[PDB]
Amino acid sequence: EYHSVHQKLSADMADNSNLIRSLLVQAEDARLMRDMKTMKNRYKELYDLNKDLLNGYKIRCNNHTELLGSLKAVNQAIQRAGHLRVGKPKNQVITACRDAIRSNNINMLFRIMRVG
C-alpha cells in the first residue's frame, strides 16, 4: 500500500507540475503584451498550485520515509534470519528469503526463516 500511495501521489504531482509549467508560459505571454489582469490571474493560479503541491510534497515525503523504514525492516529481518545460522546455511537462507519475497510468497519466507 505504501507503493500504491506513492505511485498515485507522484502521478498527481506530475499533473500539477505540467499545469505549473503551462501557467509559467501563459504568464510570460500575458506579460509580453502587458495584459496585467490575465497575468495577475496566472500568478494567482500559480500561487495556489504551489500551495497544493507543497502539501502533496509533505505527504509524499512522509509516506516515502515510512516506506524506507519498511524496506529496511524487511532487509534487516532477512539478515537477522540468516545471521542466526553459521556457514553455508547463511547465504542459503538469505537467497531463499529473497526469492520468497520477490515472488510475494510470504508463507514460504516464514517457513524458510523458521526451520530452513
Added chain:
Amino acid sequence: MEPLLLAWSYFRRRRFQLCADLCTQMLEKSPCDQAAWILKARALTEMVYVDEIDVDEEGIAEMILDENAIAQVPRPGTSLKGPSPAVRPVTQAGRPITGFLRPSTQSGRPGTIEQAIKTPRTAYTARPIASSSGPFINLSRLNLAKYAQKPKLAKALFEYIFHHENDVKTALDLAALSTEHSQYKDWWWKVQIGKCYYRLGLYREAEKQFKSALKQQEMVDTFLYLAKVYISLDQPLTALNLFKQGLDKFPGEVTLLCGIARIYEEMNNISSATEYYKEVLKQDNTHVEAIACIGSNHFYTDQPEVALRFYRRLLQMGVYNCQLFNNLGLCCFYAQQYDMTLTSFERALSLAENEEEVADVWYNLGHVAVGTGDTNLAHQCFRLALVSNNQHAEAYNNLAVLEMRRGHVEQAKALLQTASSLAPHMYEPHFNFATISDKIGDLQRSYAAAKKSEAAFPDHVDTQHLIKQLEQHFA
C-alpha cells in the same frame, strides 16, 4: 439481424456509428447487459483512436521549462539538440525542409519562451504549438477496483478512458489495479502504465515499465515506445542500439528501420538515412515516408528525373493530394518533361484544401513562369501567392527581385524588409536588401543586412565579399 449480432458485425466492418447506434438501443432496452456496453465503449473509443507512438507534440513548455537531458553540452554528433540553403529551402537557421511531415517533427527548438511566442505558431511543429501537450459513462461514478477484476471489461475500459476521454490519472489508477490483479505478468498493462507515465511527464518511470514489458515478450510496440522515451531524454545513440536490437529480434521490420532513419535525419547525417530508407524500400516499396524523403533528396541534389520517378510511384499507388501533384509538377518541369508539367499544378490547385497550399502552388507556378521567361506571369503568380497567404516571405522576396528587375527600387526595398521580417532564418531577403542598399549607398543598412545574411547562411560567398567590402569602407 439480431441486435447484438448486427452491432458486432458492424463493429467488425469498422462502421463505428451503426454499432453504437444499435447498442444504445440495446442498452435502453436492458439496463443489465455488459456485452453491448463494452461494444459501444469500443466503438466510441475507436472512432477517435490514434496510436500513441506517433503523437509527440511536446509543446512550448516542454521545450524550455523541462530539462531531462543529462549532458548539457555533449559532443557534436551524439545529440538531437547535405544540400546548402542555396539549393534546398530551409525552415530555421539550418534544418532544410523535409519530406513527409509527421506530427512528431520538432525541426529545431526555440531558445526562450519569448522567441517561441513571438514566432509563427507552426514554425516548430506540424501543428500550432500549445502550452501543454450526453456522456456514455461518467468517470467519477464507476469503481475501478471492481472493473479491474474483470480483464475483458478492464482492457476496453482503459482504452476508452485513455484514448477517448484522455483521463491519464484515472486510466493509470485502473491500469495499476489491473496489473496488480494480473500479478505483473502481462506486458500489455505494463506498456499501458508506461504510456500513462510517458504522457504524465515521468520518462524514467515509463522506461522501467517498457523494459519490463520487453522482458516479458518482444513486440514492435514496446521497441518504438522505448525509442520515444530515449529520444525524449535526448539519447539518440541509445535509441539506435535499441533499434538494432529490435531488428535482431524482428529481422526486417519496416517501422524500426524507419525510426532509425528518422533519428539519423534528426541528427542530420543524410548519408545513413538514405541507406536506411533504401532498406525500408527493399522491404515495403510503397512506404510513403521513405519514398518522399529519397525523392526530395534526389530532386534537390540536381537529379530531378529520379525524384520524378519516386513521386510517380506514389501517384501509381492511389495517393491523391495537393502536395503530391505540386511535387510532380516541380519534378516534371525541372526534369524537362513539359507535357505533364502544368496539368499537375492544375490538379494541385484543384486539390488544395487550404489557403497556404494554394499560395505555395501559385508560388511554384511563378517559379515555372520565371523559368519560362515572361516575368509578368510570374509577377501575377507571386502576387496571388501573397493574396492567398499574406505571411509568405518567399513570394515577397521573389516579387521584390522582379520589381527591382523592372526598376522600382523602393517597392523592392519594402518587400524585402517584409520578407526578412516574416522569416529571419532565410538568407535571400537579407542578402538582396544588403545588395540593393550597397548599390545605392547606405552602408550601415548594408552591413546590418549582410551580417544577418551571414547569420542565416554562414557559409555563403557573396555575403563574405560584401562584408569584406563594407568593413574596408569603414576605414
